[PDB]
Amino acid sequence: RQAFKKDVVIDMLCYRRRGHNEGDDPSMTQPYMYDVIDTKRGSRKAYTEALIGRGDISMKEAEDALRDYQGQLERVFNEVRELEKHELATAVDKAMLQRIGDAHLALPE
Amino acid sequence: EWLVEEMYRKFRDDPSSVDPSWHEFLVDYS
Amino acid sequence: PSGSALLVVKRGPNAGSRFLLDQPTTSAGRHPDSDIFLDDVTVSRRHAEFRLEGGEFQVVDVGSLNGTYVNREPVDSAVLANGDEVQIGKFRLVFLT
Description:
This is part of a larger assembly, with two copies of chain A and one copy of chain C (97 residues). By secondary structure, chain A is mainly alpha-helical. In chain A, 50% of the residues lie in helices and 0% in strands. Chain B: Residues 1-30 are annotated as: 2-oxoglutarate dehydrogenase E1, N-terminal part.
């Protein structure tokens, strides 16, 4: 985009976890699709195992990430539980008109 | 790689052995 | 200023804010109970501890996911000197003694 100033499209292929309501099981319409999603792992937890498996991170780094997950999960649950308890001249002169009337004949050389 | 399967049995049979921070990660595995 | 250190925030929402270090352990992180409260998604609940031992300031990464970069250098424990730049996630902090 910065090199050619042209639109770029990124198609992110993922999956919808739940229907469009609390009591919506779209397995009525797409049973095969939702049978796969039933046995899927979260795109955050799966990536966590991949970094351990590839030797990118250790079990100490797995604890640094798991403590950060709870530290950010508790962060919003407690902040919300605490914040819940605390609840004109519209005309011009003729000389201006004569400037606009002359601009139509102020043609370039 | 290793504790993806190993600490899952150390927590399901005895949850006191596995660190209390891995309980909110090993439950969502199986 | 006597026997104390200042942590002026260069980059962050609380830009210019100062944290005074004079205790044996001055905690820092996203936990409300932390002395140096740094709020951000990058910053972990317990990010680092500013330990002062016999007039010797030193910051230690207590197990944070994004770590702590002293002078843009990832460290686990580093003795601090006047001029260091301890980074905790997006928070850039300057060191004064």
